[PDB]
A paper describes a structure:
The solute carrier 13 (SLC13) family comprises electrogenic sodium ion–coupled anion cotransporters, segregating into sodium ion–sulfate cotransporters (NaSs) and sodium ion–di- and–tricarboxylate cotransporters (NaDCs). NaS1 and NaDC1 regulate sulfate homeostasis and oxidative metabolism, respectively. From an overall view, both the NaDC1 and NaS1 form a homodimer, and each protomer consists of 11 TMDs.
In addition, we elucidated NaDC1’s outward-facing conformation, encompassing apo, citrate-bound, and N-(p-amylcinnamoyl) anthranilic acid (ACA) inhibitor–bound states. In this section, we will predominantly focus on the detailed structural analysis of the apo structure of NaDC1. In addition, the rest sequences of NaDC1 were clearly resolved, especially the preTM1 region (residue 1 to 12 amino acids) and intracellular loop 8 to 9 (IL8–9; residue 383 to 409 amino acids), of which the counterpart has not been resolved in human NaCT structure. The two hairpin segments (HPin and HPout), loop 5 (L5) between TM5a and TM5b, and L10 between TM10a and TM10b are essential for the coordination of substrate and sodium ions. The polyalkylated tail of the lipid was firmly lodged within the hydrophobic pocket formed by HPin and TM4c, with additional stabilization facilitated through electrostatic interactions involving alkaline residues Arg112, His319, and Arg108. Although cholesteryl hemisuccinate, one of the cholesterol derivatives, was added during protein purification of NaDC1, the phospholipid site is still occupied by endogenous phospholipid-like molecule, indicating a higher affinity toward phospholipid molecules in this site of NaDC1.
Author numbering:
A (entry chain B), B (entry chain A): 2 to 164, 213 to 578
The structure:
């Protein structure tokens, strides 16, 4: 009896000791570098899902596993842990720390609740719609980095105004996370695999006639985005709240009048705030300026300030979104938090004292999620180890004996495999590798390309199970009120739903506007006929 | 009156606003990329010395300055902020956090004080000798990362046993910092520019006869190290303590018997500790194993375990010192801090609870100096911007019209310039660039190489003014009780002392054992005669 409670109390130590031993037949029986990288991937996924170690400690495992298995040496694996996206997260969290420190987050959360109201499922739908609209035009990482702290502030105000809590918290966190990545598929400039697909079409089949452009991508990918967003909202609401759809929408007495009480509490808390202080006004202006600079830097469909000022030899911007975030975060240290804020010096009773800035270093040190910086870096290191061991090439060359399958099932199997492989590795390198293989495979069996290239492009964006794929999937672990098992349990079904929605969009309304029953003349080579 | 105290209270804001404006004639009047990188260097040095901003905030300035001046784009400047040396610092600080959390640091500090005694100048000399002996054989960063927390613990125990304090603290911090870099010059494998010099001699002048080897480097560079260490001890003791040399050595009554009181207090505090706990024994064993693995990984003069296991195609180690540090730090999370430590669960009154590890994440998050990680990264970014703008090449090509100078003054001017340029940039890239220029310059004027190549190699190691050069110079800012102006004030004279000691060693006992009055036959080309 107690000898089983001793083993159940020690379960993390038993997992950490026994899971690496049980996977040893994969590197022992198959002596290859692809097998070693697969060992590292499966081990890190199991350690993240069981939470046997902290997240940031599991994230440091490529630093010891990749040099001593021979994939890549220590100096080359160490420069993967701070890229530009990781710095964009750091810079956005500086602004969020400043917003919370001067009580602007309470004012924003109370205005949001006074506009939308206190009803769980419509409030979640409103956050999902705003996040998806923002990630059509700016980066997915920046959208996540400004939308996650706002949703956390709104949830805290809603839970204090009514005095379940944890399940509504998990639902709103995952809804913002998934909306930031779902909304990026709708525009051609919304996420990087879309531009990789346009470049590979123009490179592999010249004289295609610019068949993939802004309007033809929007006409195909906007209804897919809207259908997938509504299905994601419905499934997350079912999984975390009940099957009721009546207390979810707050309908009926014993719900209608216990919401007027919380709404009156919210009105009282909003009235109890005074006028805006100097720090709140300065941070509001800087926040608006940061979002406006993110819209106009490199919009893709017209020419931004990052193309006019600061171009490279190809006309692209040398300045990125992380640069603008670090710029605003640095400016916050040099602006005084109160302008005639001259305090008499207590340890020097003849001098005055200047006020602190909108940010000081000890607040930033206490409030920054350093473990998420390490988690994002560990994901990047896993992806580079996957592309340097030859595992991505080995997984790409498995899609070639998929030829002996009828055509609507080829795309479904392909989308399943591409979403699953993207859960381990990156998504831009997979789109770089997989598209020539698929283009040759479709040229072999007299099938139109973009019948297999479009589902492969759309499937790299819809991966929802692990924090290693797509930096939004890491950013929701910042406030520490969500487990990885919640994300995997919600994301496993959402991958399958995304696969089915892609199949509906490619077998209906994708066939007319791309002429997918034709085998066009710009795809003919000397091998076809 | 008060209108001057308002301006004096606001002096950091005035510095931050006015220093970038006053330096604008350098990029405006000289429109070049070398001038832009020099602007960034001078601006960051002024912001660090005035402490107008926090150290880690000034360290983030290459991320905004280098893409928007056109030196290097955002994605390439962002991957400079986490290299292997920065990770070695992180991994060593994990072990130091574990040592302090379980009160092993108090036991170590009390044993050190019971052995050495309570006398300031001999205790400082003992720390300097141990640090210099350790950095002859292992990395300078690892030596600094384990010696700085121990010295801090010893200073805290000494100041509590006597109840000035701050000046003795600054003296011991700078002494450990400077000893870690001074001791690395004595062996051929002690620091990386020495091996760069041996490789460049073997590459530029083949059939030299292996004139630079282990024994001939040790015979030249060991007395230089000992003389420079004694002069550094004397100068730091003069600058931070008094000119007395009698209260510094604790000699004479009113000092002799107020030290027996503190020594008896130290004996009482050591006796009041009990036996060692389980956590203290586990951390002591892991600390000894980590130091023994650092000695034997790649010793240079024999074959280590990193050459036998884990070699690359050239036989070098794919595993580094940072890998071993991260390995030990990861192991500390999985070892229980008490073995039958089964606590009855308070929030679940039918189950037990396993103990926490030797490290948990919230302790690491509260205690890690994240700002020093950012400071080391900002230094690496400054160095890469210096080598990509062409500023290092431009500073190298200035040493060529030094030909019209008598020979003992060429080496002195050269060592001054090389130490000053190393204060801004790195030291391995400067040794890579400057040695062919100096070798051709010495072939032009019938002068022996290694009369100019040896002072250039030795001068890149002795730079003591800024945290950007040599990662030990950043690691002493971890405990926040030292300003950059203290380091600059102490290091400015120590650079000149190092230059004079190098001149003494190259004009005495370097002339016999390298035959520096000969112009040998392996340096002749078709241009000489
Ligand atoms: C589509 C539904 C969306 C529901 C809302 C979910 C997303 C909310 C995102 C909020 C983003 C805030 C950005 C930061 C603003 C900085 C400026 C600032 O703080 O100034 C002080 C400002 C005013 O403070 P005050 O002076 O104390 O009132 O605070 C604010 O937070 C700005 C005002 C709130 C804006 C909410 C907009 C919501 C989106 C549209 C909702 C449409 C609902 C449709 C149904 C309506 C029925 C009537
Ligand atoms: C040359 C002068 C050097 C002066 C000392 C400055 C540098 C001190 C570095 C200390 C490094 C400690 C490494 C970590 C040890 C882990 C093991 C551990 O904690 O085990 C428990 C161990 C014993 O604890 P206990 O059981 O409570 O006594 O604690 C220790 O800290 C180890 C014992 C102290 C070692 C000090 C050695 C100092 C270097 C040689 C000094 C020579 C002085 C010449 C004049 C002598 C006059 C009589
Ligand atoms: C949490 C910390 C304590 C690490 C936990 C241990 C395991 C997760 C790792 C660390 C070291 C790894 C080993 C490092 C090196 C090797 C040798 C490697 O040997 C080969 O087959 C290479 C053959 C060749 O190079 O010719 C096989 C995998 C293995 C055993 C690895 C298996 C997985 C190990 C034991
Ligand atoms: C602390 C934060 C608010 C930054 C503080 C401002 C300055 C430290 C920096 C930031 C932007 C910098 C500018 C960025 C770009 C340029 C354009 C650059 O233009 C050229 O001469 C390039 C000519 C060419 O490319 O042909 C000259 C330097 C300058 C003014 C830089 C001068 C120094 C500035 C003003
Ligand atoms: Na986007
Ligand atoms: Na060394």
């Amino acid at each position: 009896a107690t000898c089983w409670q001793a083993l159940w109390a020690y379960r993390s130590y038993l997992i950490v000791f026994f899971v690496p031993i049980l996977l040893l037949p994969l590197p022992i029986l198959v002596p290859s570098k692809e097998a070693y990288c697969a060992y590292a991937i499966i081990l890190m996924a199991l350690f993240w899902c069981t939470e046997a170690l902290p997240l940031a400690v599991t994230a440091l495992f490529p630093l010891i596993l990749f040099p001593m298995m021979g994939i890549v040496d220590a100096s080359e694996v160490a420069v993967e842990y701070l890229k530009d996206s990781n710095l964009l997260f750091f810079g956005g969290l500086l602004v969020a720390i400043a917003v919370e420190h001067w009580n602007l987050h309470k004012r924003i959360a109370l205005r949001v609740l006074l506009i939308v109201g206190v009803r769980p499922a419509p409030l979640i739908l409103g956050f999902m719609l705003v996040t998806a609209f923002l990630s059509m035009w700016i980066s997915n990482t920046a959208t996540s980095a400004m939308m996650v702290p706002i949703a956390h502030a709104v949830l805290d105000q809603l839970h204090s105004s009514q005095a379940k809590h944890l399940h509504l918290t998990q639902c709103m966190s995952l809804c913002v996370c998934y909306s930031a990545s779902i909304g990026g598929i709708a525009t051609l400039t919304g996420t990087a695999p879309n531009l990789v697909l346009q470049g590979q079409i123009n490179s592999l089949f010249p004289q295609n006639g610019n068949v993939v452009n802004f309007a033809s991508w929007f006409s195909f990918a906007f209804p897919t985005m809207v259908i997938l967003l509504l299905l994601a909202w419905l499934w997350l609401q079912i999984l975390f709240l009940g099957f009721n759809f009546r207390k979810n929408f707050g309908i009926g007495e014993k719900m209608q009048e216990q919401q007027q009480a919380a709404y009156c509490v919210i009105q009282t808390e909003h009235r109890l705030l005074g006028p805006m202080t100097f720090a709140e006004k300065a941070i509001s202006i800087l926040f608006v300026i940061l979002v406006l600079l993110w819209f106009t830097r490199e919009p893709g469909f017209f020419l931004g300030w990052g193309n006019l000022a600061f171009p490279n030899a190809k006309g692209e911007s040398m300045v990125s979104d992380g640069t603008v975030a670090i710029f605003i975060g640095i400016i916050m240290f040099i602006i005084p938090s109160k302008f005639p804020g001259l305090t008499q010096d207590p340890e020097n009773p003849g001098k005055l004292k200047a006020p602190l800035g909108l940010l000081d270093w000890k607040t930033v040190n206490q409030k920054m999620p350093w473990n998420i910086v390490l988690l994002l870096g560990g994901g990047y290191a896993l992806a580079k180890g996957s592309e340097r061991s030859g595992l991505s090439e080995w997984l790409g060359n498995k899609l070639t004996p998929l030829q002996s399958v009828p055509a609507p099932a080829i795309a479904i199997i392909l989308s399943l495999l591409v979403a699953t492989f993207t859960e381990c590795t990156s998504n831009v390198a997979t789109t770089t590798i997989f598209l020539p293989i698929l283009a040759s495979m479709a040229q072999a069996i007299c099938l139109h390309p973009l019948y297999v290239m479009l589902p492969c492009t759309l499937a790299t964006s819809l991966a929802f199970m692990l924090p290693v794929a797509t930096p939004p999937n890491a950013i929701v672990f910042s406030f520490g009120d969500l487990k990885v098992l919640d994300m995997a349990r919600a994301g496993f079904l959402l991958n399958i739903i995304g696969v089915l929605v892609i199949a509906l969009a490619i077998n209906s309304w994708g066939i007319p506007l791309f002429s997918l029953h034709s085998f066009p003349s710009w795809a003919q080579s000397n091998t076809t006929a």
